[PDB]
Design a protein around this nucleic acid. Structure first.
Ligand SMILES: [Zn+2]
Ligand SMILES: [Zn+2]
Lengths: 77, 81, 499, 76, 83, 114, 311, 106, 74, 510
RNA sequence: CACUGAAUCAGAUAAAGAGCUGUAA
RNA sequence: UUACAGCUCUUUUAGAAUUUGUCUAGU
């Protein structure tokens, strides 16, 4: 069970897409081989577009569909 | 400057020392959010909360629960309030 | 005082449970004690009750096969033996794991066990190690072992008791090998040869013709998309087969995609002995250790069990046991016998009553371990890899030494008697060489006379056709005759005076 | 996941009708698998549900999302 | 060792693929790196939502367990492993 | 009968209830799937992960459309019911399969096969 | 590369290792911040102690050994690392609590000596010592624990608790490794916070728990022969309790437990011979040669081995 | 024969199948479900649908598993297809424990 | 001082709990025993669906993957 | 009455080389030829006239002090005779000469011996094993050869010349009685009372500390330098005593509770990979404790999991910045042991641990005694032009912590003197060592020996006619041994007083 | 006709045991 | 004679809790 290669996303501004249509942004500060993320300065983008600063969070990796990059992230070949 | 990473087992354990009220978001259950204070957590992220309450987003009711043990399979986020 | 009694307590007119008592001038040497691999319980021991283990001086174990070292933890621990036992360095490192596998296979059999593994490990401290060609002395017995070939660590123990020089060859081979050397003809000619008689008057296919027929067999199986099963023993010829297939795939770039496996947990634990003891190899490997170890494989990996590898495309898996009683070499067969592309290669040997001997008659339908009947359609090829001597290598070995007395052990009674009949009619025409061949059975002693002049030395004050008077010291058999004055000069104890 | 008792090599390079959990039906040349039922199907079909057909090509199917495999026909 | 389809997915690193998640979104884009547990880093993504829309993204990273199937490029069907 | 050739796959079976429905390989059963589809055929070689490789099925979709097939392979996770036959006696066909594994795990020795 | 960038790289590495092989990486983090550059220990303290909540049991046993090696290097850090040592003592594993009792054995003498070197104390340091003494009294309650190993390490703790909380005399034979450790003679009695009379009765109340533990009928074998050597260490180092140890030796010698077999009854009888022979050399044992020499005859010791060790 | 006694004068685990794991689990909820094997208690198993409840099986219990897999025999299942209750009788069933919701006892 | 979840259930056996399942089903009763996977055996169990009493079931053995939270009720 | 004479060709009065010429009845054993560190020609001209009265060159311990002249004595001086040496002398002594050529070929135009002379001298060599009695065939007929373990380096031998009879001419130089980590000690009890012993007196006055006491001060010097963020240079051999320290260090770098593995062991030879690759092949040549831990646990004891081996300065720079390097040459004269000395002797946070006491004309003898700082020493480079070598001189200001810790495996003067006393050699010579310490060993073997010992202290180019008369003639007992009782070697078991006539080969008649 | 074999599941579960090697008293 | 680390073994028990080995989508 190899860990994720999320070192390219460290201290980058993510825009996470959780399950159930929930969507948060913020800056990654760490992870684990279960892909449980820690998101500093996390902003809750609600369904009505209302943004909510929710501090820094622990997001369980079981419910992370997709995480896009709002900043430039290194790529391999 | 490369900072040491904030692993997720640190920051849950940081709530345990601080006695800080958290607000759990639930896995595939958008309307209800458990809001308690961590007295203990497990290997599999089973949270023992205290003075916990269900926060229905549509009903706006705060059903007082008490000393519960939320399981790890249900957590999708750990907001700190 | 005068006679020499070679009493075969085992492997007399049989293969297995080897044991030879060597009694000459008060010293008893037991040569190469093992169990019989075809018997059960306490019957597999040699006839140890014909002697008492309290007065056996030496114990020279030739190599690590169970018919040559198997009865040893019973003998060193569970009897009244207090002598000194000797192996080579590479025998003892395989002995501890070869026999740890013995008490695991004899654990799922009947519970009248000979010994256990906690009785095996406390036997390792009583075993001393002789290196090759080095002269060790126990109770006045010089003995030094030669390279016997045939396995990694085997030995031909030359034994010299009072000028009578005997050679026990054990199981030896005289063909140059990929990882072994030929059996060494000594520069010292023995007075008594105790030689194996495993084949008698058989013959081998030539080595360049067997390894070509082997490599063409492995290559034709993987060209038709099939799987290659090579059932072989874990330690005898598995390691030599590996050198052939790894070398053969350095010489062929197209075969790099498919893989070669060896599937044994005994060959895993004993592969480090083949990587370490490079000085007991031949000259071909110990000059190739300058670049890289040839037992650190470049295209061959271990297979822990057949759950680990996916059976996608061709592969060559050489598992153990060799005669396919049970285990992983049997379940790889049953998974592969229902396809025409696959092919089994019986590289070792077979015994009547095993699956590897029943397959050679091409049965139409073999029986699974669970009782199911599977149609046998995979190709069967029998390619011998004997690592012993035929008649042209045993008779060449016995022309080079010319022993006055030859004792045949470690051979079945029909193939030992045909070897004695051939050795007698090979030396009944010429007159200057005389060989008296024996084939004694169990318990039947061979009485040989070796009367020799006793020679002493004066070197003290008596050293300068006159009279000789003084005190004489006998060390073990070496005599010295000295002055009464020269006990503080040569002898450790100088004098005795009371008032 | 799949162990060696279910011989998945029986139907290699065949044409396999694979029904997914959502209800879609993949029909393609069964190239390769693993111990997780990751299916390499070649020249695929996608039957949703009256029902529409889509041509996909070389589809890797995650083995969590497999319900039933059946044989459409011989190797074409 | 890893299986053949994971090795086949590593031989598609650097081509435009199609990924559909468990939630119904279809992700069309160049994939930069895929992992042994099918975690696919991708780039220059055209998405197609469950309700049916088109948005265009820059760089994503998809969890491997949240991928329903991957549509590999039709060039790749002549791989040395699929033969 | 037939057991697995994998120690990894026969000891998951020996320690679990799966060894039950490996005891009724060859009998016509009805396998109700997790998505409320019905598969009714002859069980052949169900593994340690309940991947049932049925033989000759009257497979029913979850909308009710019977499409009769000639081979079908059910995923282990997409199972809820295995309608085992009437003349089975559950605790005996478990003890028969545990007897078959016990004679494969030991299986005699040398000089005794023939 | 800088140590404060090598430690960060070894903590990003030890945060992604899943199995029990992270402690090879993680003991390297120990040796770089307490031995090579101890000034970084104040910086990376909050990231090592985060590994005490780990899934593995040897990672949280590393944290117990780390707090032991950081409080003996900087005892000022005990104000933070004592809230993280009781929850490793209240841990649900039993190999983890045995390591937490070993660490409380060394970090009680050092914690008490730190409380008396401070002539003035602070209220946050008041909250530390009553938390050390609360978890020192709970290891006494771990003599009633249902594990053989928890009871064994707790016996070796209360011998480090009796000797610490009972004063020295002129004939107190103390070894050269235990010389500068604190006793109850170098305590201050005019101290502000900690009190002499509280620790006076605390040292003998911990004795009474050790005494009645040994007259228990269901005491184990290796717990007994550790408690026999622990009564011999609180007699040679503290001759104030010489009248009480010999009373507990003869009570055990007249009343052995019948539950342990003869192959380990003779191991109790052998080791009881060794400690009574070793206590005889101590000069405060000459008062009670009517009891020690009486008991050694019943154990099977000749007169020559008794008469050789008389000082 | 006689020679084994001449050599003995020179001398100077349990099976772990599925059925042996049945009487275990005693300090657990699974071992209380072993009393239904012994005492013959009618067991009505709730079966999950994709999200919620599907039906109740109501059968005598034979031979359970770690995974809550179990072989009910005298089954009378009352279930609901996605309100139309359709009860059908099964003379012997195998329910895998992924689908079970809670084991009610009667 | 922290209170981990395995000491939480072991200090709650014999007491009235109210296990809420993942989809609104809720079962109060006397927690008898739990195991390492936290299967919850409940005795004298009555069912609360939608917060209202449905029916006294009896003895109820809830599988691990159904519990949302267990709550000590009084 | 064999004419046993030996001429000290070199290797006496602290010319710390070895080359001896022990004649046994017109059979010239050339015992143990070797160069010193800086290649003097005082042995080469002393071996021009003895390169044709020579046969059976008997080597010893693998190092250039015992086999260094042998690539030059074979490739240039042309001796065609048998060269008897054991297998680790063959495989590690070849490894010294590939790290004596190349360690100077990186710095200077070195053309004394080429690598084609190392191969030529190490192909005409007969690999022996310990206690392998080798009977010579030719102009020396009654002479047998027996190597016995010495314990200094791997496969280090003492020899045992035996003439037909009991003329026993044991050559025991630089031996070691203690059982160290990767070697077991020398026996010297299979030989009992010899006719001649050729021993050294290099440590005859040396009071050696305990091995447990000097493993602590190594570990104290290694740790305190590394905790202060500084490299450690260790000057060892390239195959002989580097196997002791790389086994001493790696069992400490494994089995300490702290995280030692952050500090990056190295092992700089030019041929360093083959050093550990051959030492993990001669496991049957090592200590019994070290051999039993292979035969019971299948771990090769030279399978190092912390020694990051390096072949040059380019491979050395790719390890983390604090490091413990054990250098190529024990003297600081050539190789990377000099190059790493000059790079970090100017930095006070570094340590330099000299482990071997070399010849007195060397830079590493200048640092063991007389510790000075502002000293002048040459610098030998080789720049890119095809290259060209540079010689230049510098003042270096040694301010690293230089410490000599004695890791040469030799016996001290209370055991190099006890073994000769526990033996009873009928003749003794004392053959290398200073004149201060050769007299200290001569005036105890003459004193606490017998009236007939006759020790020698020969000077350089001095022969010693060490042949003593104990005329021996071989009589075979003819008729009876029955009326006697024939007692044994152990104790007074019986009594064997025997009279008799002769018949002059002769016999004995009552 | 030449002499034995994957010990009841994953390259790391948990309690209680063992033996060797080393180093601290 | 005690206590800690390093590797090799023996019974008991786990191998049903987040990326495929026992389901909050099967919309
Ligand atoms: Zn053999
Ligand atoms: Zn044989």
């Amino acid at each position: 069970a190899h860990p994720p290669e999320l070192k390219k996303f460290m201290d980058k501004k993510l825009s996470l897409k959780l399950n159930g249509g929930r969507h948060v942004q913020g800056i990654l500060r760490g992870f684990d081989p279960f892909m449980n993320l820690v998101i500093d300065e996390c902003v809750e983008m609600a369904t009505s577009g209302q943004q909510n600063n929710i501090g820094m969070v622990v997001i369980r990796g079981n419910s992370i569909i997709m995480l896009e990059a709002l900043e430039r992230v290194l790529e391999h070949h | 400057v490369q900072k040491v990473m904030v692993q997720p087992i640190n920051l849950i354990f940081r709530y345990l020392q601080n006695r800080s009220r958290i607000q759990v978001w639930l896995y595939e259950q958008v309307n209800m959010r458990i809001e308690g204070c961590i007295i203990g957590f497990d290997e599999y992220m089973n949270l023992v909360l205290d003075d916990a309450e269900e926060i229905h987003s549509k009903t706006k009711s705060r059903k007082q629960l008490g000393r519960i043990m939320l399981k790890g399979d249900n957590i999708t986020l750990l907001q700190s309030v | 005082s005068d006679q020499l009694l070679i009493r075969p307590l085992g492997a007399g007119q049989e293969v297995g449970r080897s044991c030879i008592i060597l009694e000459f001038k008060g010293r008893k040497i037991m040569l190469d004690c093992g169990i019989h691999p075809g018997l059960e319980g306490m019957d597999a021991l040699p006839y140890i009750d014909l002697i008492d283990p309290a007065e056996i001086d030496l114990l020279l174990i030739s190599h690590f096969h169970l018919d040559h070292c198997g009865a040893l933890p019973w003998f060193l621990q569970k009897t009244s033996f207090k002598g000194r036992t000797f192996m080579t360095h590479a025998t003892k490192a395989i002995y501890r794991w070869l026999l740890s596998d013995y008490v695991k296979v004899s654990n799922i059999s009947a519970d009248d066990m000979l010994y256990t593994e906690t009785d095996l490990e406390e036997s390792m401290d009583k075993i001393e190690t002789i290196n090759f060609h080095e002269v060790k002395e126990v109770a006045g017995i010089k003995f030094w072992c030669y390279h016997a070939g045939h396995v990694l660590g085997a030995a031909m123990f030359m034994i010299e008791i009072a000028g009578v020089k005997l050679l026990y060859t054990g199981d030896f081979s005289r063909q140059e090998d990929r990882h072994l050397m030929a059996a060494e003809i000594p520069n010292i000619k023995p007075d008594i040869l105790i030689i194996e008689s495993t084949y008698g008057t058989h013959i081998h296919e030539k080595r360049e013709e067997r390894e070509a027929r082997f490599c063409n067999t492995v290559h034709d199986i993987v060209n038709r998309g099939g799987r290659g099963l090579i059932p072989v023993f874990a330690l005898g010829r598995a390691q030599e087969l590996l050198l052939i297939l790894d070398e053969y795939w350095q010489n062929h770039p197209e075969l790099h995609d498919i893989p070669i496996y060896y599937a044994s947990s005994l060959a895993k634990k004993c592969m480090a002995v083949y990587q370490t003891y490079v000085n007991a190899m031949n000259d071909k490997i110990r000059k190739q250790i300058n670049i890289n170890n040839p037992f650190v494989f470049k295209h061959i990996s271990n297979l822990k069990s057949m759950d680990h590898f996916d059976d996608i495309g061709p592969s060559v898996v050489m598992a153990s046991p060799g005669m396919m009683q049970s285990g992983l070499s049997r379940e790889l067969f049953e998974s592969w016998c229902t396809d025409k592309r696959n092919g089994v290669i019986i590289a070792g040997y077979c015994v009547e009553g095993t699956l590897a001997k029943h397959i050679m008659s091409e049965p139409e339908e073999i029986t699974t371990m669970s009782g199911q009947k599977l149609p046998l359609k995979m190709s069967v090829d029998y390619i011998s890899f004997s690592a012993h001597t035929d008649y042209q290598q045993t008779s060449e070995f016995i022309r080079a030494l010319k022993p006055p007395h030859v004792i045949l052990v470690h051979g079945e009674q029909n193939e030992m008697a045909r070897l004695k009949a051939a050795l007698i009619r090979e030396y009944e025409d010429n007159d200057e060489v005389h060989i008296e061949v024996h084939n004694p059975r169990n318990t039947e002693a061979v009485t040989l006379n070796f009367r020799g002049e006793k020679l002493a030395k004066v070197m003290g004050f008596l050293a300068d056709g006159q009279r000789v008077s003084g005190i004489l010291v006998k060390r073990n058999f070496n005599y010295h005759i000295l002055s009464p004055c020269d006990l503080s000069n040569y002898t450790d104890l100088a004098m005795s005076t009371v008032k | 996941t799949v162990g060696k008792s279910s011989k998945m090599l029986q139907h290699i390079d065949y044409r396999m009708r694979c029904i997914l959990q959502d209800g879609r039906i993949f029909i393609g040349t069964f190239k390769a698998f693993d111990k997780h039922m990751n299916l390499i199907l070649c020249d695929c079909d996608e039957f949703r549900k009256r029902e529409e057909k889509r041509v996909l090509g070389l589809v890797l199917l995650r083995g969590e999302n497999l319900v039933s495999m059946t044989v459409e026909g011989p190797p074409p | 060792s890893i299986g053949v389809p994971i090795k086949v997915l590593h031989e598609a690193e650097g081509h435009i693929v199609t990924c559909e998640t468990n939630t119904g979104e279809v992700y069309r884009g160049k994939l930069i790196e895929a992992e042994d547990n099918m975690n696919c880093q991708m780039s220059n993504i055209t998405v197609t939502y469950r309700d049916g829309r088109v948005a265009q993204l820059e760089q994503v990273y998809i969890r491997g367990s949240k991928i329903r199937f991957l549509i590999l490029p039709d060039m790749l069907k002549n791989a040395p492993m699929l033969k | 009968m037939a057991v697995s050739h994998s120690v990894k796959e026969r000891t998951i079976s020996e320690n679990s209830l799966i060894i039950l429905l490996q005891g009724l390989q060859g009998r016509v059963t009805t396998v109700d799937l997790r998505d409320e589809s019905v598969a009714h055929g002859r069980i052949d070689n169900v593994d340690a992960f309940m991947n049932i490789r049925l033989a000759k099925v009257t497979y029913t979709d979850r909308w009710g459309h019977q499409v009769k097939l000639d081979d079908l392979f059910v995923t282990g996770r997409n199972v809820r019911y295995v309608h085992i036959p009437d003349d089975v006696n559950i605790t005996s066909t478990i003890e028969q399969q545990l007897q078959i594994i016990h004679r494969v795990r030991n299986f005699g020795g040398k000089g005794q096969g023939r | 590369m800088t140590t404060s960038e090598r430690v960060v790289d070894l903590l990003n590495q030890a945060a992604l290792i899943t199995n029990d092989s992270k402690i090879t990486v993680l003991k390297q983090v120990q040796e770089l911040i307490i031995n090579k550059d101890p000034t970084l220990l104040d910086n990376f303290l909050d990231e090592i102690i985060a590994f005490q909540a780990d899934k593995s049991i040897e990672v949280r046993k590393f944290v117990i050994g780390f707090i032991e090696e950081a409080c003996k290097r900087d005892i000022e850090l005990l104000l933070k690392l004592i809230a993280n040592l009781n929850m490793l003592l209240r841990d649900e594993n039993v190999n983890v609590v045995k390591k937490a009792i070993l660490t409380m054995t060394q970090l009680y003498k050092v914690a008490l000596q730190w409380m008396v070197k401070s002539r003035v104390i602070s209220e946050l340091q008041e909250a530390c010592w009553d938390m050390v003494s609360a978890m020192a009294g709970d290891i006494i309650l771990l003599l009633d624990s249902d594990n053989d190993g928890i009871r064994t390490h707790a016996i070796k703790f209360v011998e480090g608790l009796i000797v610490t909380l009972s004063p020295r005399m002129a004939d107190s034979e103390i070894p050269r490794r235990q010389e500068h450790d604190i006793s109850l003679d170098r305590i201050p009695r005019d101290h502000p916070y900690i009190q002499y009379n509280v620790l006076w009765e605390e040292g003998k109340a911990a004795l009474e728990q050790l005494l009645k533990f040994m007259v228990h009928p269901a005491i184990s074998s290796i717990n007994l022969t550790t408690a026999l050597g622990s009564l011999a260490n609180i007699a040679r180092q503290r001759p104030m309790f010489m009248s009480e140890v010999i009373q507990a030796y003869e009570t055990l010698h007249a009343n052995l437990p019948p539950t342990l077999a003869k192959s380990q009854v003779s191991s109790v009888r052998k080791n009881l011979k060794l400690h009574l022979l070793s206590v005889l050399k101590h000069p405060a044992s000459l008062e009670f040669q009517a009891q020690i020499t009486t008991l050694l005859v019943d154990l099977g010791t000749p007169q020559a081995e008794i008469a050789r060790n008389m000082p | 024969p006689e020679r084994i006694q001449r050599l003995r004068r020179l001398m100077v685990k349990a099976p772990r199948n599925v059925l042996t794991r049945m009487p275990l689990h005693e300090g657990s909820p699974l071992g209380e479900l072993h009393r239904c094997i012994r005492e013959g208690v009618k067991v009505n198993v709730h079966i999950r649908t994709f999200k919620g409840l599907r039906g109740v099986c109501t059968g005598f219990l034979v031979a359970f598993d770690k995974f809550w897999n179990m072989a009910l025999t005298d089954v009378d299942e009352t279930y609901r297809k996605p309100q139309q209750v359709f009860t059908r009788h099964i003379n012997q069933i195998f329910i895998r424990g992924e689908n079970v919701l809670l084991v009610h006892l009667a | 001082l922290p209170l981990n979840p395995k000491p939480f259930l072991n200090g709650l056996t014999g007491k009235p709990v109210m296990v809420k399942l993942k989809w609104g089903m809720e079962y109060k009763g006397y927690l008898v025993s739990v195991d390492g996977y936290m299967n919850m055996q409940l005795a004298n169990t009555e069912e609360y669906i939608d917060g209202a009493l449905s029916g006294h079931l009896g003895e109820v053995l809830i599988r691990c993957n159904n519990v949302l939270y267990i709550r000590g009720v009084e | 009455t064999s004419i046993i004479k030996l001429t000290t060709l070199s290797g006496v009065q602290e010319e710390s080389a070895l080359c001896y010429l022990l004649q046994v009845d017109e059979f010239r054993f050339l015992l143990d030829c070797g160069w010193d560190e800086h290649f003097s020609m005082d042995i080469i001209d002393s071996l021009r006239k003895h390169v044709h009265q020579i046969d059976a060159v008997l080597l010893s311990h693998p190092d250039p002090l015992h086999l260094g002249a042998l690539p030059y004595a074979v490739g240039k001086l042309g001796l065609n005779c048998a060269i008897y040496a054991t297998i680790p002398v063959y495989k590690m002594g070849q490894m010294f000469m590939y790290d004596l050529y190349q360690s100077r070929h990186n710095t200077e135009d070195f053309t004394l011996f080429t690598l084609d002379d190392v191969d030529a001298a190490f192909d005409k060599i007969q690999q022996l094993k310990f206690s392998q009695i080798v009977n010579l065939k030719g102009k020396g007929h009654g002479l047998s050869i027996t190597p016995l373990p010495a314990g200094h380096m791997i496969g280090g031998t003492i020899w045992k010349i035996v003439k037909d009879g009991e003329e026993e001419i044991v050559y025991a130089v630089d031996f070691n009685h203690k059982r160290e980590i990767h070697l077991n000690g020398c026996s010297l009890e299979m030989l009992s009372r010899p006719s001649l012993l050729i021993t050294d007196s290099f440590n005859a006055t040396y009071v050696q500390p305990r091995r447990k006491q000097r493993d602590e001060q190594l570990l104290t010097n290694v740790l305190e330098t590394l905790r202060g963020d500084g490299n450690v240079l260790i000057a060892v051999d390239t195959a002989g005593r580097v196997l002791e320290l790389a086994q001493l260090l790696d069992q400490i770098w494994r089995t300490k509770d702290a995280g030692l593995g952050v500090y990056s062991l190295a092992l700089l030879n030019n041929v360093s990979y083959n050093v550990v690759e051959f030492s993990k092949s001669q496991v049957e040549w090592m200590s019994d404790k070290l051999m039993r831990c292979f035969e019971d646990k299948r771990n090769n004891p030279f399978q190092f999991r912390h020694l990051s081996l390096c072949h040059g300065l380019s491979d050395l720079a790719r390890v983390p910045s604090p490091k413990v390097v054990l250098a190529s040459q024990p003297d600081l004269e050539c190789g990377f042991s000099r190059d790493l000395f000059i790079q970090w002797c100017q930095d006070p946070k570094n340590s330099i641990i000299l482990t071997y006491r070399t010849t007195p004309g060397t830079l590493a003898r200048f640092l063991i005694d007389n510790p000075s700082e502002k000293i002048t020493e040459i610098e030998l480079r080789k720049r890119v032009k095809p290259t060209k070598c540079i010689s230049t001189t510098e003042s270096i200001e040694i301010k690293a912590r230089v410490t000599y810790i004695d890791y040469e495996g030799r016996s001290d003067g209370d055991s190099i003197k006890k073994i000769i006393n526990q033996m009873k050699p009928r003749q003794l010579i004392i053959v290398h060592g200073p004149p201060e310490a050769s007299q200290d060993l001569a005036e105890c073997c003459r004193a606490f020996g017998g009236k007939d010992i006759k020790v020698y202290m020969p000077k350089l180019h001095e022969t010693v006619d060490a042949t003593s008369e104990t005329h021996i003639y071989q009589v075979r007992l003819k008729d009876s041994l029955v009326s006697s009782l024939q007692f044994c070697k152990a104790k007074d078991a019986e009594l064997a007083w025997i009279d008799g006539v002769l018949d002059m080969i002769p016999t004995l008649e009552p």
